[PDB]
Amino acid sequence: ITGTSTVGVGRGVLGDQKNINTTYSTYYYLQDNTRGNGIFTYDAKYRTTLPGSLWADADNQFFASYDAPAVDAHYYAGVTYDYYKNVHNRLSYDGNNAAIRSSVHYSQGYNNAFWNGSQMVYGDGDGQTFIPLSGGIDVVAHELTHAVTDYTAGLIYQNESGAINEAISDIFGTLVEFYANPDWEIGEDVYTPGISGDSLRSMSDPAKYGDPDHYSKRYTGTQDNGGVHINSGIINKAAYLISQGGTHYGVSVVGIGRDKLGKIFYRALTQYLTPTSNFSQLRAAAVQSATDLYGSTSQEVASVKQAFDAVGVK
Numbered sequence: 001i002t003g004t005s006t007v008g009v010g011r012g013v014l015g016d017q018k019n020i021n022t023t024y025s026t027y028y029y030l031q032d033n034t035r036g037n038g039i040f041t042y043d044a045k046y047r048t049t050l051p052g053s054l055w056a057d058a059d060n061q062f063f064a065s066y067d068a069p070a071v072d073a074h075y076y077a078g079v080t081y082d083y084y085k086n087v088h089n090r091l092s093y094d095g096n097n098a099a100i101r102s103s104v105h106y107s108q109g110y111n112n113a114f115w116n117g118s119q120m121v122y123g124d125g126d127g128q129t130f131i132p133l134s135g136g137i138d139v140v141a142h143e144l145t146h147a148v149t150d151y152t153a154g155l156i157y158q159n160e161s162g163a164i165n166e167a168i169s170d171i172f173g174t175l176v177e178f179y180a181n182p183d184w185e186i187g188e189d190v191y192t193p194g195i196s197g198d199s200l201r202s203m204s205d206p207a208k209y210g211d212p213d214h215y216s217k218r219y220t221g222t223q224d225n226g227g228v229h230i231n232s233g234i235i236n237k238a239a240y241l242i243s244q245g246g247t248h249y250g251v252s253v254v255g256i257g258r259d260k261l262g263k264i265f266y267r268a269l270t271q272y273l274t275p276t277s278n279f280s281q282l283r284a285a286a287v288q289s290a291t292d293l294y295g296s297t298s299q300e301v302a303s304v305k306q307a308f309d310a311v312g313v314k
């Protein structure tokens with residue numbers, strides 16, 4: 001853990017070569033000392049006990065297939081850190097350079113990734129529905145954004161507040177993807193290696209995969225903790241409209257770009273949203289955020305208003 005900072009090289013899940021910040025002490029550890037209190041990547045070794053062992057490597061080369069998820073987890077955690085630092089002046093997820101820890105090779109054939117309240121966890125996928133989810137920069141940013149949310153708004157993971165929590169992670173997950181071949185889809189890089197052109201969720205058109213793109217169409221049952229991954233499509237659609245514009249259900253929205261989208265939603269996240277905020281309170285938080293930044297008469301406030309009107313959120 002105490003060692004000499006250095007730079008290693010390896011290949012990611014998608015076979016792309018990347019340099020990665022490591023630490024040398026007998027072994028080369030996946031420990032990035034250049035970012036906050038450090039970014040640490042662990043090997044769970046197909047087990048479920050966490051975090052596992054700090055990834056140790058003999059030669060500082062990571063070209064083994066078994067290394068691939070660790071390379072991308074380590075690397076994309078760094079990119080996501082840079083994003084929040086450089087774009088939003090936030091230092092790590094807690095705002096005080098908290099150590100970012102990630103575990104890969106979690107369980108066997110685990111088709112999911114998550115923030116467990118203290119760290120990143122990535123499954124390898126079963127190789128048909130998913131390949132190792134570390135390969136998706138939007139996936140990585142999505143999960144770390146949960147840390148940001150938990151330390152700020154604190155949106156509980158249930159019903160509409162949970163839907164907002166999920167949406168925030170999709171939105172900033174996408175903005176990081178744009179920050180680093182970007183798009184307004186979620187997990188396309190790691191989802192379904194057999195079929196091309198699909199994804200887990202779409203922000204541009206949520207209904208593509210059965211998720212609501214309007215408040216009238218919202219899920220109200222009990223599964224998915226009240227549809228946190230489902231009803232997020234409603235907010236994801238609004239976020240997309242604010243950035244890219246377009247006409248949705250007859251309501252025209254003027255786009256203001258991704259950078260203003262990020263500034264608005266980040267401010268909403270950190271200044272106005274609470275653990276129990278619903279879509280309507282999010283709407284109000286976004287309108288006030290844009291008002292703070294750009295003025296009550298600005299096109300940015302109008303676009304946010306037209307966006308939530310478009311997805312039926314008053």
Ligand SMILES: [Ca+2]
Nearest residue numbers: 057059061062
């Ligand atoms: Ca090696």
Ligand SMILES: [Ca+2]
Nearest residue numbers: 181182183188
């Ligand atoms: Ca992409």
Ligand SMILES: [Ca+2]
Nearest residue numbers: 138185186187
């Ligand atoms: Ca994407």
Ligand SMILES: [Ca+2]
Nearest residue numbers: 191192193195
């Ligand atoms: Ca696919």
Ligand SMILES: [Zn+2]
Nearest residue numbers: 142146166169
């Ligand atoms: Zn999530």
